[PDB]
Design a protein around this nucleic acid. Structure first.
Ligand code: ZN
Lengths: 94, 177, 156, 36, 39, 146
RNA sequence: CCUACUUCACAAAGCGCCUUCCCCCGUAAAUGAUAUCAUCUCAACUUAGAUACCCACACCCAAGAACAGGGUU
């Protein structure tokens, strides 16, 4: 699991719901899904960069070709952040 | 970063649309920037093989300015195939015929001579006026600022500025002008 | 020695006013302290290091592979402490030396995986019309290091 | 007539610079009209 | 229909016609089907 | 400044002396430009200065009325001309291509129909060669020929 | 392009008939600065100063080497 990030290992469907559940468990709140940036859109090669805000503070933010996809990505990122992963992680002691 | 792989990759690449207003600017001073953008040399990801070029919208190209006497002096010169088909045209004339042309030519010259040049040119969007199409406007992200600063004529300077500036000499009270 | 407002009276560039050195020093100290605190807390997550090995500079992290084109004269599986970590960075803070960081601050560890030869590389000379045609095949020896760990300390 | 060195022949003659070249014009003696 | 289709593609994607025209057999044979993938 | 007033009758009327600016920074200079310290620190850009040595219909004023050193006077004139060419003195007039830095009048320049080989090539003049000693400031000098 | 003529003859020619649509740049001349007159102005200025065509099996042909094109009521 050195290179392999989560979601490759534990594959899932509908991360938004999961996030919501996790949020509830944690803070007793629900996330808004704002759209941070977008080049294209009508071009046929857009770059929708979509956030996820909780009480006017972004917990995560992800990219995508389409808006739904972007949202999904953001959700995934949020999940990763929650579950002590990310690309950063910590090296692990051997 | 976080992110899954493909989406990250997409984010890294993805063609951004940029805007340039002409109006009083020199072509080629526009084109330097535009050419760079087209190439994708403004990205730290740049390679000739990767295809990282962005879109450049340029507007108000009818309101280009030329430095010195280039409107009258600068000759754009091309051949048809045909004997006696050597056409030389002064920049002004060219502009009058097609206002998009001058900027475009400059951009072309700036770009590397490889086959990608024409593809790069297709990501260039030139307009003679403020009227850009709707799709293109939707696409746009950021205007990078104009090279030439615009000198500002006396009508625009306002009174306060004038007051601030000193009057350097006394005329004779008997002088007409 | 005054000039009224024109295009060439004042500079094109804006005038920067660099701050007072005592205050600046204090600020720097504060920053350092913060960094130290962070280090203590384990608030970081994965480090990287620009290390200097075999005249090349390498941005390196835990778990990565590096290929050095020469013999190190080490048995494989031996562990190495790489000196000359001239950059050590992470999310939220970075440390650069002048040019090298101190040994107390940081250390990078590397296990030698394998010692090998390169694929055969062809040298070949030629000149027109002058019967000059040489051909030498070479295999430059190589070593593969696996960087295991970047330890970073609270010395600052 | 064309000349690289323009000279006034008469007092009525005058040098003018027009169209990026120096000319000599005289209202009395139009012979002395010269170009650069 | 071919040319029209090509034109449409170009319009969509902002690029020249030349890439959409289908390249020959030799070239395709040459192409690496299992390239060395990394990371 | 005086003015002729005609209706036959003719009269003369005086109105509003500029009266200088109060106290120059370098006094005991010989000129309006010289005293202040704009020896090499003006251009066509700056029209608040140029308009001071200009007639109501855009022409220059003479050296003897302004009181400018001759070398400077010429420069000033050139600047004024440039400004006019640009379109920076619209309220100064006798009674479509954008422009700046024009040394020659637009009419009176024949096109560079045969720019020669690079070792003897024809160049389009941009700006005046009077304004060389103008403060270049950047590490390269002014490219007066394009 | 072929109604006569002529070469000719279900056509194709000329010796026959028909149609043919813009500028041009050197100078000349006002007002007018630098240089309070004057001066055509590489001073600011004012005068003399592109439309048309083109674009949706078979058999015969004013279409044609083949290919293509037109017609087949
Ligand atoms: Zn002086």
């Amino acid at each position: 699991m050195t290179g392999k990030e989560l979601f490759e290992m534990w594959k899932i469907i509908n991360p938004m719901g999961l996030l919501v559940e996790e949020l509830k468990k944690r803070n007793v709140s629900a996330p808004e899904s704002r759209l941070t940036r977008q080049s294209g859109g009508t071009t046929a090669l857009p770059l929708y960069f979509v956030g996820l805000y909780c009480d006017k503070k972004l917990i995560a933010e992800g990219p995508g070709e389409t808006v739904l996809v972007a949202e999904e990505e953001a959700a995934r990122v949020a999940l990763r952040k929650l579950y002590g992963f990310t690309e950063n992680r910590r090296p692990w002691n051997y | 970063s976080s992110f899954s792989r493909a989406p990250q990759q997409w984010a890294t690449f993805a063609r951004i649309w940029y805007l340039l207003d002409g109006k009083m600017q020199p072509p080629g001073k526009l084109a330097a920037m535009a050419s760079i953008r087209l190439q994708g040399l403004h990205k730290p990801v740049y390679h000739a093989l990767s295809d990282c070029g962005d879109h450049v919208v340029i507007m108000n190209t009818r309101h280009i300015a030329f430095s010195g006497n280039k409107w009258e002096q600068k000759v754009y010169s091309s051949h048809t195939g045909y004997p006696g088909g050597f056409r030389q045209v002064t920049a002004a004339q060219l502009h009058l015929r097609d206002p998009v042309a001058i900027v475009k030519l400059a951009i072309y010259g700036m770009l590397p001579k490889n086959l990608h040049r024409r593809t790069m040119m297709e990501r260039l969007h030139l307009f003679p006026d403020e009227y850009i199409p709707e799709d293109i406007l939707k696409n746009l992200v950021e205007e990078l600022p104009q090279p030439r600063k615009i000198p500002k004529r006396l009508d625009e300077y306002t009174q306060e500025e004038i007051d601030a500036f000193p009057r350097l000499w006394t005329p004779p009270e008997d002088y007409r002008l | 020695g005054y000039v009224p407002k024109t295009s060439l009276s004042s500079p094109p560039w804006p005038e920067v006013v660099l701050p007072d050195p005592v205050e600046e020093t204090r600020h720097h100290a504060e920053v350092v302290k913060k960094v130290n605190e962070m280090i203590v807390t384990g608030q970081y997550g994965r480090l990287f290091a620009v290390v200097h090995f075999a005249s090349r500079q390498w941005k390196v992290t835990s778990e990565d592979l590096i290929l050095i084109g020469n013999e190190l004269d080490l048995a494989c599986g031996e562990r190495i402490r790489l000196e000359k970590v001239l950059l050590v960075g992470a999310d939220n803070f970075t440390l650069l030396g002048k040019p090298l960081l101190g040994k107390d601050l940081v250390r990078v560890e590397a296990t030698v995986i394998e010692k090998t030869e390169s694929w055969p590389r062809i040298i070949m000379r030629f000149r027109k019309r002058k019967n000059f045609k040489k051909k030498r095949i070479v295999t430059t020896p190589q070593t593969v290091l696996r960087i295991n760990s970047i330890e970073i300390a609270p010395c600052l | 007539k064309n000349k690289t060195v323009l000279k006034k022949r008469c007092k009525d003659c005058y040098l003018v610079k027009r169209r990026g070249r120096w000319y000599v014009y005289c209202k009395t003696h139009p012979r002395h009209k010269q170009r650069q | 229909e071919e040319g029209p289709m090509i034109e449409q593609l170009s319009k969509m994607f902002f690029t020249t016609k030349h890439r959409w025209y289908p390249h020959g057999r030799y070239h395709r044979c040459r192409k690496n089907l299992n390239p060395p993938k990394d990371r | 400044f005086r003015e002729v007033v005609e209706t036959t009758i003719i009269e003369g009327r005086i109105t509003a002396t500029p009266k200088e600016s109060p106290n120059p920074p370098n006094p005991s200079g010989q000129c309006p430009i010289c005293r202040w310290n704009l020896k090499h620190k003006y251009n066509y850009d700056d029209v608040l200065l140029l308009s001071q040595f200009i007639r109501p219909h855009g022409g220059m004023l003479p050296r003897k009325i302004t009181g400018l050193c001759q070398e400077e006077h010429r420069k000033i004139e050139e600047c004024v001309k440039m400004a006019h060419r640009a379109g920076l003195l619209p309220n100064h007039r006798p009674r479509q291509l954008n422009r700046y830095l024009t040394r020659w009048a637009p009419g009176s320049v024949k096109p560079i129909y045969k720019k020669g080989p690079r070792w003897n090539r024809v160049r389009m003049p941009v700006g005046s060669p009077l304004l060389r000693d103008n403060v270049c400031y950047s590490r390269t000098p002014w490219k007066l020929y394009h």
